[PDB]
């Protein structure tokens, strides 16, 4: 869910097992060095959706759907500037790759049992 995604991205921020962006995310996918992924659908994506579904239809790549590109960029560590309340300017991200190691948490179990369903 949303709070489980926030927890796993905060664990990625606290344990540096994170691969943001597009180029290094696809590189970590092709390196067999990935655990989880997300995706932002229903946007202005003429070719990006078909390229990323070809990229994620490879080896049990998990996805979490989200409406906008905006609130994904708050719990990932994108624009951690002006922390006095609301953020100043957060740019849009599409997908992120998480390869957490210290996964002794309830939220990982919740999201993984949600994935095996």
């Amino acid at each position: 869910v949303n709070t489980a995604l926030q927890e796993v991205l905060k664990t990625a921020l606290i344990h540096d097992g994170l691969a943001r962006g597009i180029r290094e995310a696809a590189k970590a996918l092709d390196k067999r060095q990935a655990h989880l992924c997300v995706l932002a659908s229903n946007c202005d994506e003429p070719m990006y959706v078909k390229l990323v579904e070809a990229l994620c239809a490879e080896h049990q790549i998990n996805l979490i759907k989200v409406d906008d590109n905006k609130k994904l960029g708050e719990w990932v560590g994108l624009c951690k500037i002006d922390r006095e309340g609301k953020p100043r300017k957060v740019v849009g991200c599409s997908c992120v790759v998480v390869k957490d190691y210290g996964k002794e948490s309830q939220a990982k179990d919740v999201i993984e049992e949600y994935f095996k369903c």
Partner: protein, 68 residues
């Protein structure tokens, strides 16, 4: 300042736009057949690509130019 010689300008680089999307050829079936060659070095994995020029194939970092 104002000098007699013409001013030398720095390398005004061009901005890319979805480069790897031009090399992952995707059809309506389950095929991900690529347009660019992968790396032959075992230092890294299989993520980076090589240069596709008209007469040679250059690395990103291995600097192993492939001739014809």
């Amino acid at each position: 300042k104002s000098y007699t010689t013409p001013k030398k300008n720095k390398h005004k680089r061009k901005k890319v736009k979805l480069a790897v999307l031009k090399y992952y050829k995707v059809d309506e079936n389950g095929k991900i057949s690529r347009l660019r060659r992968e790396c032959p070095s075992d230092e890294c994995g299989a993520g980076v690509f090589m240069a596709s020029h008209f007469d040679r194939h250059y690395c990103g970092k291995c600097c192993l130019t492939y001739c014809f």
